[PDB]
């Protein structure tokens, strides 16, 4: 049986909330956030990993990422696999602009061997993965102003669609005042939502596309 409530923050598997700025790096923050969870679960250390390393070094057709022009979490993971590593934020900090790649293997702080994609639209599979694997990268439709109006409760705007546009991180789930939710870490700083997080409707027919494109890496 799966736990009724999960919050990876409580297990020290989630780093501080980041601020992407004007750079379209949501995908990179979502990817590093999933890998940070796995790194903590394997090594016992909680380390912020370099979103900028992803932005600078996978901006080419091989990956179909475009740096600050947007990208995909699974292609971030594929880069880390191909590259044999990724740096920590501390040695490769965030600039919110495209830069020339300067990855250095002496500063490797994590690796990725493979990644897993969950079945499209399957919220039961997402629940199982969050409970048993760790934080999971997902895409959502975050294109409605109500997403930024949100401060507390469970986000469930009827104007959401299945047409996703932003990569974020699912770090838990539960039920709040009788409404099932996913606990989502964003990359808009602490001023977004509830200290950087939004609780999004769970079990409402794949609302906002949250279970359409779920993936997580393995160290």
Ligand X SMILES: *C(=N)C1(NC(=O)[C@@H]2C[C@@H](S(=O)(=O)c3ccccc3C(F)(F)F)CN2)CC1
User: Which listed residue (164, 171, 200, 210) binds ligand X by CB under 6 A?
Assistant: 164
Which lies closer to ligand X via its Cβ, residue 28 or residue 110? 28
Which lies closer to ligand X via its Cβ, residue 15 or residue 58? 58
User: Which listed residue (127, 166, 185, 199) binds ligand X by CB under 6 A?
Assistant: 166
| Residue 71 interacting with ligand X (CB under 6 A) | yes
| Residue 196 interacting with ligand X (CB under 6 A) | no
Applying CB under 6 A, the span of 90-98, 123-131, 145-153, 161-169 interacting with ligand X comes to 161-169
**102 flagged as catalytic:** no
- Cα 107–109–110 angle (5° rounding)? 135
| Residue 40 interacting with ligand X (CB under 6 A) | no
Which lies closer to ligand X via its Cβ, residue 134 or residue 167? 167
| Residue 27 interacting with ligand X (CB under 6 A) | yes
CB of 164 to ligand X, least distance (A): 4
User: Which listed residue (7, 11, 47, 70) binds ligand X by CB under 6 A?
Assistant: 70
Applying CB under 6 A, the span of 24-32, 101-109, 126-134, 177-185 interacting with ligand X comes to 24-32
Q: What is the 3-state secondary structure (H, E, C) of the chain?
A: CCCCCEEHHHHCCCCCCCECCCCECHHHHHHHHHHHHHHHHHHCCCCCECHHHHHHHCCCCCCCCCCCECCCHHHHHHHHHHHCCEEECCCCCCCCCCCCCCCCHHHEEECCCEEEECCCCCHHHHHHHHHHCCCEEEEECCCCCHHHHCCCCCECCCCCCCCCCEEEEEEEEEEECCEEEEEEECCECCCCCECCEEEEECCCCCHHHCCCCCEEEEC
Footprint on this chain of ligand X (rule: CB under 6 A)? 24-27, 70-73, 139, 164-167, 213
């Amino acid at each position: 049986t799966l736990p009724d409530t999960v919050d990876w923050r409580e297990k020290g598997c989630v780093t501080e909330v980041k601020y992407q700025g004007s750079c379209g790096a949501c995908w990179a923050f979502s990817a590093v956030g999933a890998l940070e969870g796995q790194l903590k679960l394997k090594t016992g250390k909680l380390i912020s990993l370099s979103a900028q390393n992803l932005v600078d070094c996978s901006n080419e057709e091989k990956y179909g990422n475009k740096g600050c022009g947007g990208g995909y979490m699974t292609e971030a993971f594929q880069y880390i696999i191909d590259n044999g590593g990724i740096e920590a934020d501390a040695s490769y900090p965030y600039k919110a602009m495209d830069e020339k790649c300067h990855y250095n293997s002496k500063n490797r702080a994590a690796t990725c061997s493979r990644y897993i994609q969950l079945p499209f639209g399957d919220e039961d599979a997402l629940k199982e993965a969050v409970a048993t694997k760790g934080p999971v990268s997902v895409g959502i439709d975050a294109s409605h102003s109500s997403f930024f109006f949100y401060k507390s409760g469970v986000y469930d705007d009827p104007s959401c669609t299945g047409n996703v546009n932003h990569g974020v991180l699912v770090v838990g789930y539960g039920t709040l005042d009788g409404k099932d939710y996913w606990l989502v870490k964003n990359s808009w700083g602490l001023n977004f939502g509830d200290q950087g997080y939004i609780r999004m409707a769970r079990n409402n027919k794949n609302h906002c596309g949250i279970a359409s494109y779920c993936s997580y890496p393995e160290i």
